[PDB]
Design an enzyme around this catalytic site. Structure first.
Site, PDB file in Angstrom:
ATOM      1  N   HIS B  42       0.724  -1.440  -0.334  1.00 10.50           N
ATOM      2  CA  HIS B  42       0.498   0.149   0.089  1.00 10.50           C
ATOM      3  C   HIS B  42       0.381   1.169   0.211  1.00 10.50           C
ATOM      4  O   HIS B  42       0.149   2.213  -0.698  1.00 10.50           O
ATOM      5  CB  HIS B  42      -1.198   0.169   0.920  1.00 10.50           C
ATOM      6  CG  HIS B  42      -0.381  -0.098   2.439  1.00 10.50           C
ATOM      7  ND1 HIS B  42      -0.784   1.802   3.040  1.00 10.50           N
ATOM      8  CD2 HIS B  42      -0.248  -0.715   3.579  1.00 10.50           C
ATOM      9  CE1 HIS B  42      -0.050   1.562   4.194  1.00 10.50           C
ATOM     10  NE2 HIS B  42       0.502   0.345   4.389  1.00 10.50           N
ATOM     11  N   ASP B  88      -1.096  -7.349   1.574  1.00 13.27           N
ATOM     12  CA  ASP B  88       0.450  -5.951   1.802  1.00 13.27           C
ATOM     13  C   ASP B  88       1.668  -6.102   1.743  1.00 13.27           C
ATOM     14  O   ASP B  88       2.004  -6.319   3.661  1.00 13.27           O
ATOM     15  CB  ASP B  88      -0.410  -5.500   2.729  1.00 13.27           C
ATOM     16  CG  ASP B  88      -0.482  -3.685   3.053  1.00 13.27           C
ATOM     17  OD1 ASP B  88      -0.119  -3.197   2.299  1.00 13.27           O
ATOM     18  OD2 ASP B  88      -0.687  -3.209   4.279  1.00 13.27           O
ATOM     19  N   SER B 185       3.796   2.148   8.967  1.00 11.95           N
ATOM     20  CA  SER B 185       3.924   1.566   7.464  1.00 11.95           C
ATOM     21  C   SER B 185       4.682   0.869   7.061  1.00 11.95           C
ATOM     22  O   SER B 185       5.025   1.869   6.924  1.00 11.95           O
ATOM     23  CB  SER B 185       2.614   2.301   7.056  1.00 11.95           C
ATOM     24  OG  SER B 185       1.448   2.849   7.075  1.00 11.95           O
ATOM     25  N   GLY B 186       4.991  -0.442   6.697  1.00 10.98           N
ATOM     26  CA  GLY B 186       5.723  -0.820   5.371  1.00 10.98           C
ATOM     27  C   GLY B 186       6.508  -1.436   6.808  1.00 10.98           C
ATOM     28  O   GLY B 186       8.070  -2.225   5.742  1.00 10.98           O
TER      29      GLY B 186
HETATM   30  C1  LIG Z   1      -2.239   5.458   4.090  1.00  9.84           C
HETATM   31  N1  LIG Z   1      -2.615   6.098   5.276  1.00  9.84           N
HETATM   32  C2  LIG Z   1      -3.392   6.646   5.815  1.00  9.84           C
HETATM   33  C3  LIG Z   1      -2.914   4.696   6.031  1.00  9.84           C
HETATM   34  C4  LIG Z   1      -2.490   3.590   5.530  1.00  9.84           C
HETATM   35  C5  LIG Z   1      -3.726   2.995   6.917  1.00  9.84           C
HETATM   36  N2  LIG Z   1      -3.694   3.934   7.785  1.00  9.84           N
HETATM   37  C6  LIG Z   1      -4.951   3.591   8.920  1.00  9.84           C
HETATM   38  O1  LIG Z   1      -4.911   1.962   9.131  1.00  9.84           O
HETATM   39  C7  LIG Z   1      -4.647   4.474   9.994  1.00  9.84           C
HETATM   40  C8  LIG Z   1      -3.192   4.457  11.044  1.00  9.84           C
HETATM   41  N3  LIG Z   1      -3.747   3.563  11.167  1.00  9.84           N
HETATM   42  C9  LIG Z   1      -2.057   2.797  11.399  1.00  9.84           C
HETATM   43  O2  LIG Z   1      -1.846   2.662  10.402  1.00  9.84           O
HETATM   44  C10 LIG Z   1      -1.319   1.772  12.459  1.00  9.84           C
HETATM   45  C11 LIG Z   1      -2.220   0.782  13.750  1.00  9.84           C
HETATM   46  C12 LIG Z   1      -1.159  -0.358  13.410  1.00  9.84           C
HETATM   47  C13 LIG Z   1      -0.643  -0.057  12.268  1.00  9.84           C
HETATM   48 CL1  LIG Z   1       0.275  -2.004  13.257  1.00  9.84          CL
HETATM   49  S1  LIG Z   1      -0.560   0.051  11.934  1.00  9.84           S
HETATM   50  N4  LIG Z   1      -6.608   3.341  10.380  1.00  9.84           N
HETATM   51  S2  LIG Z   1      -7.488   4.296  10.009  1.00  9.84           S
HETATM   52  O3  LIG Z   1      -8.916   3.692  10.986  1.00  9.84           O
HETATM   53  O4  LIG Z   1      -7.324   5.686   9.959  1.00  9.84           O
HETATM   54  C14 LIG Z   1      -7.260   4.106   8.573  1.00  9.84           C
HETATM   55  C15 LIG Z   1      -6.875   4.665   7.616  1.00  9.84           C
HETATM   56  C16 LIG Z   1      -7.557   4.391   5.875  1.00  9.84           C
HETATM   57  C17 LIG Z   1      -8.049   2.535   5.943  1.00  9.84           C
HETATM   58  C18 LIG Z   1      -7.956   2.382   6.451  1.00  9.84           C
HETATM   59  N5  LIG Z   1      -8.113   0.684   6.760  1.00  9.84           N
HETATM   60  C19 LIG Z   1      -7.307  -0.333   6.226  1.00  9.84           C
HETATM   61  C20 LIG Z   1      -7.178  -2.031   5.615  1.00  9.84           C
HETATM   62  C21 LIG Z   1      -8.638  -1.816   5.876  1.00  9.84           C
HETATM   63  C22 LIG Z   1      -9.866  -1.123   5.595  1.00  9.84           C
HETATM   64  C23 LIG Z   1      -9.558   0.382   5.738  1.00  9.84           C
HETATM   65  O5  LIG Z   1      -9.995   1.373   5.716  1.00  9.84           O
HETATM   66  C24 LIG Z   1      -8.267   2.768   7.787  1.00  9.84           C
HETATM   67  O6  LIG Z   1      -8.144   1.604   9.189  1.00  9.84           O
HETATM   68  C25 LIG Z   1      -9.443   1.757   9.179  1.00  9.84           C
HETATM   69  F1  LIG Z   1      -9.318   0.209   9.983  1.00  9.84           F
HETATM   70  F2  LIG Z   1     -10.085   2.148   9.377  1.00  9.84           F
HETATM   71  C26 LIG Z   1      -3.862   4.770   7.671  1.00  9.84           C
END
Ligand SMILES: CN(C)[C@H]1CCN(C(=O)[C@H](CNC(=O)c2ccc(Cl)s2)NS(=O)(=O)c2cccc(N3CCCCC3=O)c2OC(F)F)C1
Ligand SMILES: [Ca+2]
Lengths: 53, 234
Positions: B42, B88, B185-186
């Site tokens: 991602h 991923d 991330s990653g």
């Molecule tokens: C590219 N950036 C902007 C994204 C990449 C993944 N992201 C998130 O998961 C965010 C912030 N939390 C994290 O990054 C992590 C938390 C713990 C670990 Cl391990 S990684 N959590 S989140 O709530 O704000 C979120 C933001 C964007 C996408 C998601 N996802 C993750 C994949 C499954 C569906 C989804 O909506 C998502 O998680 C979801 F569970 F809510 C931010």
């Protein structure tokens, strides 16, 4: 427990049972020691080691 | 990383940083060898073009360990889907080889069955990166790390508003406000065994960061070991 289950078969890294006996092996950057258990680095900065030196 | 400690000299030498055209770090990575970096799939569409930086512990100042590397080939997993963040995982081939030194060393790739029997069954793993220090905060200037316990898979599924696939595992705390976050991330999830750290996971996603009743979600590296080994032939 038995063999690899008991203290990783005395191997530093990988353990798999083979002909009842245990066989130890190592990751890249290491070679198995003469004891057939220890993993000896083949150069500085072998994988997995915190570089405190 | 929310909470945790900062990585001291030589403590997290497998940490890599993906940097964009503006020199901003946007994702982490793990050093596997002189030519290869492990990262999340991602991360590869959060920029138009990127490079890899190693030996970095402080993004606002320069430091003797640092070196930049350009990617020759990006091997993204063809089954990756952003709707679930399933599959991923991606492998980067660098043009020039990394020189291993203080703060620059690969994490070990474990064997599939041994990892599942021996590494996954440990109490905790360690996760590091330059990601956010609070769910809504900014990126950390310093490389931080955090010891995260392995979470039971059933408890993990019952906590999640989204699907947990066979290619994912949970780690972190229930209520304690310590977790990985956006920007990590990653990056590396490693597990310790007899003073050696094996790469066991990739920072993938979570429902915010450090939330009560929620854990961090990591790409399960053991499901892709043959795939990673195949990537390191071409
Ligand atoms: C590219 N950036 C902007 C994204 C990449 C993944 N992201 C998130 O998961 C965010 C912030 N939390 C994290 O990054 C992590 C938390 C713990 C670990 Cl391990 S990684 N959590 S989140 O709530 O704000 C979120 C933001 C964007 C996408 C998601 N996802 C993750 C994949 C499954 C569906 C989804 O909506 C998502 O998680 C979801 F569970 F809510 C931010
Ligand atoms: Ca620096």
């Amino acid at each position: 427990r038995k063999l690899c289950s008991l203290d990783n078969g005395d191997c530093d890294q990988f353990c798999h049972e083979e002909q009842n006996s245990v066989v130890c092996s190592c990751a890249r950057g290491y070679t198995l020691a003469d004891n057939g258990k220890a993993c000896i680095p083949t150069g500085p900065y072998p994988c997995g080691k915190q570089t405190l030196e | 990383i929310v909470g945790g400690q900062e990585c001291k000299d030589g403590e997290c030498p497998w940490q890599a940083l993906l940097i964009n055209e503006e020199n901003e770090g946007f994702c982490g990575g793990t050093i596997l060898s002189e030519f290869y970096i492990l990262t999340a799939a991602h991360c590869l569409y959060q920029a138009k073009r990127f490079k890899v930086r190693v030996g970095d512990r402080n993004t606002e100042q320069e430091e003797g360990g640092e070196a930049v590397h350009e990617v020759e080939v990006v091997i993204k997993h063809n089954r990756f889907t952003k709707e679930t963040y399933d599959f991923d995982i991606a492998v980067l081939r660098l043009k020039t080889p990394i020189t291993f030194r203080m703060n620059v060393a690969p994490a070990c790739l474990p064997e599939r069955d041994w990892a599942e029997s021996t590494l996954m069954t440990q109490k905790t793993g360690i996760v590091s990166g330059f990601g956010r220090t609070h769910e809504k905060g900014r990126q950390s200037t310093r490389l931080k790390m955090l010891e995260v316990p392995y979470v039971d898979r059933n408890s993990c599924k019952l906590s999640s508003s989204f699907i947990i696939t066979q290619n994912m595992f949970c780690a972190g705390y229930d209520t304690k406000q310590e977790d990985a976050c956006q920007g990590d991330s990653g990056g590396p999830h490693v597990t310790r065994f007899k003073d050696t750290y094996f790469v066991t996971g990739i920072v993938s996603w979570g429902e915010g960061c450090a939330r009560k009743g929620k854990y961090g979600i990591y790409t399960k590296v053991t499901a892709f070991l043959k795939w990673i080994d195949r990537s390191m032939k071409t």
